[PDB]
Amino acid sequence: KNPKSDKFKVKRFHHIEFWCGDATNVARRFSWGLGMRFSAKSDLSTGNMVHASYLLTSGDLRFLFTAPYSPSLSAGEIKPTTTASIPSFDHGSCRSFFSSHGLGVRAVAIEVEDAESAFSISVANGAIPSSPPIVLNEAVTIAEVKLYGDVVLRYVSYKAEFLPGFERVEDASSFPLDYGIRRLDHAVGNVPELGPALTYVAGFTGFHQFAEESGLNSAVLASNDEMVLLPINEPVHGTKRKSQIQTYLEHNEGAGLQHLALMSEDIFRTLREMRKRSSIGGFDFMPSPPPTYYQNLKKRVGDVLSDDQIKECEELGILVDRDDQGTLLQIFTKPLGDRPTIFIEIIQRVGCMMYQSGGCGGFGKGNFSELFKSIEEYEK
Amino acid sequence: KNPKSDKFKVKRFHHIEFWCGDATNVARRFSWGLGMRFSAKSDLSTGNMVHASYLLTSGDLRFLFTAPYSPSLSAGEIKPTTTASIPSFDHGSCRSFFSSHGLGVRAVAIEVEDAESAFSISVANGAIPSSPPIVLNEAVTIAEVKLYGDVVLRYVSYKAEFLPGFERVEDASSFPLDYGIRRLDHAVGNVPELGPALTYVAGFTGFHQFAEESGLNSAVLASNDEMVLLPINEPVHGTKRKSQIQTYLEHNEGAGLQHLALMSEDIFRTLREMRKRSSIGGFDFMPSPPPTYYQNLKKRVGDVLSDDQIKECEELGILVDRDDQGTLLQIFTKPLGDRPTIFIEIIQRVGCMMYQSGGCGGFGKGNFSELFKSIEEYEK
Ligand SMILES: Cc1ccccc1-n1c(=O)c2c(C)c(C(=O)C3=C(O)CCCC3=O)ccc2n(C)c1=O
Numbered sequence: 001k002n003p004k005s006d007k008f009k010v011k012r013f014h015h016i017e018f019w020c021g022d023a024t025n026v027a028r029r030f031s032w033g034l035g036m037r038f039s040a041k042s043d044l045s046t047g048n049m050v051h052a053s054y055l056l057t058s059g060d061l062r063f064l065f066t067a068p069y070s071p072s073l074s075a076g077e078i079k080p081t082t083t084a085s086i087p088s089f090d091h092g093s094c095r096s097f098f099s100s101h102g103l104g105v106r107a108v109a110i111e112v113e114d115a116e117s118a119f120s121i122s123v124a125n126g127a128i129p130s131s132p133p134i135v136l137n138e139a140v141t142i143a144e145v146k147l148y149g150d151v152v153l154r155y156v157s158y159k160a161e162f163l164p165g166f167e168r169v170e171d172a173s174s175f176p177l178d179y180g181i182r183r184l185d186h187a188v189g190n191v192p193e194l195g196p197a198l199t200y201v202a203g204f205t206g207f208h209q210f211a212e213e214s215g216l217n218s219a220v221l222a223s224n225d226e227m228v229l230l231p232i233n234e235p236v237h238g239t240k241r242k243s244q245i246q247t248y249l250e251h252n253e254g255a256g257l258q259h260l261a262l263m264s265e266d267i268f269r270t271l272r273e274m275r276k277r278s279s280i281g282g283f284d285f286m287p288s289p290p291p292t293y294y295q296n297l298k299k300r301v302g303d304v305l306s307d308d309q310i311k312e313c314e315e316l317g318i319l320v321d322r323d324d325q326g327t328l329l330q331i332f333t334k335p336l337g338d339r340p341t342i343f344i345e346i347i348q349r350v351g352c353m354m355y356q357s358g359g360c361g362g363f364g365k366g367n368f369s370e371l372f373k374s375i376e377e378y379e380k
Numbered sequence: 381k382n383p384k385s386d387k388f389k390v391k392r393f394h395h396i397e398f399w400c401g402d403a404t405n406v407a408r409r410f411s412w413g414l415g416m417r418f419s420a421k422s423d424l425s426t427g428n429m430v431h432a433s434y435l436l437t438s439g440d441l442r443f444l445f446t447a448p449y450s451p452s453l454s455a456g457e458i459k460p461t462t463t464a465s466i467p468s469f470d471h472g473s474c475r476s477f478f479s480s481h482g483l484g485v486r487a488v489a490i491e492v493e494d495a496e497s498a499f500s501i502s503v504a505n506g507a508i509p510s511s512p513p514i515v516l517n518e519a520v521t522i523a524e525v526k527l528y529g530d531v532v533l534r535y536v537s538y539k540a541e542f543l544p545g546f547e548r549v550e551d552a553s554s555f556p557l558d559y560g561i562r563r564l565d566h567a568v569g570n571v572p573e574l575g576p577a578l579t580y581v582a583g584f585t586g587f588h589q590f591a592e593e594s595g596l597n598s599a600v601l602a603s604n605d606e607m608v609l610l611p612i613n614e615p616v617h618g619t620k621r622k623s624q625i626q627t628y629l630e631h632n633e634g635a636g637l638q639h640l641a642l643m644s645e646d647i648f649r650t651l652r653e654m655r656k657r658s659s660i661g662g663f664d665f666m667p668s669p670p671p672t673y674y675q676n677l678k679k680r681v682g683d684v685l686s687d688d689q690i691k692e693c694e695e696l697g698i699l700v701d702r703d704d705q706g707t708l709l710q711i712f713t714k715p716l717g718d719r720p721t722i723f724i725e726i727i728q729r730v731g732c733m734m735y736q737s738g739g740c741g742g743f744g745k746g747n748f749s750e751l752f753k754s755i756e757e758y759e760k
């Protein structure tokens with residue numbers, strides 16, 4: 001049941017912004033490890049004296065990496081005269097964010113029909129304002145409200161090329177890397193208390209709950225067409241293994257974004273390419289499930305995937321789950337930085353043709369059961 | 381003339397430590413871009429609740445990347461009970477360093493016969509203490525004194541494997557990258573005033589001055605065998621082009637380390653490998669000199685390098701200079717991070733066989749003249 005209760009017109013995920021200490025090194029690492037191209041920049045060479053911002057793209061996926069310069073470079077500026085291309089940026093907010101949480105997502109950005117209206121309606125419906133609507137070059141409007149912890153939901157709307165004040169990146173500097181990633185599928189928050197978090201976000205967006213010893217309880221909020229998907233987790237305390245949600249909250253100094261799920265047009269090629277690079281600058285993946293997991297794959301998805309497709313899942317450590325309408329292939333990286341906090345999920349969805357409907361196959365909750373069973377069946 | 385005035389026994393460069401916001405991402409980028417292997421770690425998985433530290437090695441070159449965790453993880457600790465493997469580390473010093481300078485070198489470390497004595501003698505001779513000698517596992521002694529800005533000179537001495545509390549890195553995580561870099565040749569500071577800087581460092585080390593519109597004046601301090609080489613630059617104001625030393629000081633918020641020079645056993649292979657990776661996560665190089673520069677190469681080094689060796693220099697953008705005892709091949713990267721501050725030099729030295737004596741060929745000062753001449757000769 002989807003009651004289509006969005007309080008403003010939402011289109012799709014637009015971009016994810018990381019706040020960094022050094023945007024250059026994080027962006028180069030991510031570009032190589034994920035196969036994303038350098039597509040736009042805003043930094044000293046473009047006249048921005050406040051922050052360095054580099055955009056990576058793969059298909060529709062946009063990763064933005066931002067870090068502050070010395071405040072002394074812009075000490076004479078005021079907000080009306082700023083050279084920052086992202087006017088919501090603030091030196092002390094960024095340094096405090098990074099000192100508090102380490103490397104992580106500052107903004108989850110979605111494209112809307114009118115960022116000014118989305119903001120007003122959101123705050124009218126309980127959203128805590130973060131940065132008021134600002135019009136850039138009479139061309140783009142951006143506004144921000146608090147989502148959870150120090151993560152903001154950022155509204156972007158266009159009259160009719162990333163943001164004003166960004167330049168396209170030199171063809172020589174932009175190597176056309178591509179491992180198959182095409183768009184952001186969902187973005188997941190960890191909070192101490194799921195209930196108040198759900199009530200707050202659903203309160204100001206109008207997003208509806210999406211049809212659903214693991215360490216957590218979770219729920220998923222969705223836009224009208226269910227293309228914007230925002231799960232939220234809370235810990236479940238006092239168990240055999242310690243809750244990874246609780247571990248996150250401790251090392252992140254509170255609530256924040258837990259994982260980004262990136263849809264691939266070919267998860268087997270994406271994982272082959274990422275795994276080749278794991279030990280030469282890229283990303284590591286979580287430990288592979290036992291062969292018992294893959295022995296049991298035939299009995300549950302043998303109708304969707306061939307024996308060779310299933311054997312390819314075993315080589316790459318891919319996980320498989322399934323809904324009543326579709327099948328999900330997924331895998332998780334190890335944490336992206338120093339702290340055991342944010343990680344990435346690679347996913348591909350099979351089914352729900354109508355175009356493919358959002359959430360087709362779920363989010364892999366059934367893989368908790370199948371992993372536990374397999375990781376006792378393999379013991380013998 | 382080398383009066384061998386070292387006030388304690390110095391052996392050679394030991395390691396360079398970068399203070400980072402996220403050690404993981406800087407270290408992975410550097411590993412891929414320079415061809416260095418992951419060799420040791422000290423982090424949560426080794427019991428260190430204070431900082432994450434990752435060591436990269438290539439030959440004798442050791443790059444250490446360190447970033448602080450949340451202070452909350454170690455709030456109950458005191459210095460006697462610390463889990464930090466580098467006891468001179470301090471959360472607030474590290475965050476203040478990085479907020480002030482961005483990514484850069486915190487420590488230039490040299491191996492000495494006794495770090496306790498080196499420290500005492502240094503301070504007895506004017507050095508500003510930074511961290512007193514501390515003995516690790518009755519096996520290694522480390523101490524630190526101020527060098528310039530917020531950069532420290534770190535003394536390390538061993539009784540007879542990087543540091544106690546570091547673990548060797550997993551063979552699966554340690555891919556054997558190698559592009560030919562073998563050791564640190566020199567490490568260069570930028571200061572507002574060269575005179576007082578020279579007097580201060582030479583005062584407490586006993587290092588002697590090494591035989592010597594560019595934007596700078598510079599001088600080089602050397603150990604007894606001249607294997608430890610520490611140039612220092614100051615700006616020269618009011619000129620056609622703005623001093624790059626002055627640009628550094630402005631963007632770095634004061635004095636600090638300007639460049640690290642890494643000796644290659646085969647600079648042509650090193651530069652081929654680094655240049656292949658420039659646009660896929662590695663390092664960019666400064667713009668290549670004009671063909672006039674390379675046309676003039678025959679008349680000055682045609683006796684050292686063949687026509688093919690000189691043509692290979694032109695393909696790779698290598699610079700060549702020469703002393704009275706040796707020849708220097710060198711090239712400079714673009715800045716390593718967001719700010720136009722620290723960069724890397726790749727070098728190879730030809731001559732001065734005795735083993736090769738330090739500084740063989742100089743530091744490339746003559747390449748200022750030859751670059752200016754070439755960059756007017758090419759105009760026509
Ligand atoms: C628990 C755990 C510990 C150490 C490494 C990995 C895991 N771990 C996961 O983190 C995990 C996740 C994060 C999802 C997932 O993507 C997800 C949810 O957890 C809630 C619904 C929305 C959503 O997107 C699904 C299955 C998972 N499974 C099966 C698993 O084992």
Ligand SMILES: Cc1ccccc1-n1c(=O)c2c(C)c(C(=O)C3=C(O)CCCC3=O)ccc2n(C)c1=O
Pocket residue numbers: 566568594595598599611612613624639666712725743744745747748751
């Ligand atoms: C000035 C400048 C501007 C934009 C990019 C590059 C340059 N630039 C240099 O930075 C440069 C350096 C840094 C050295 C060098 O390694 C060095 C010194 O400058 C002082 C003595 C000790 C030492 O090691 C030598 C030649 C150089 N040359 C020729 C050059 O053009």
Ligand SMILES: [Co+2]
Pocket residue numbers: 186188259261345363
């Ligand atoms: Co997920």
Ligand SMILES: [Co+2]
Pocket residue numbers: 566568639641725743
């Ligand atoms: Co040099």
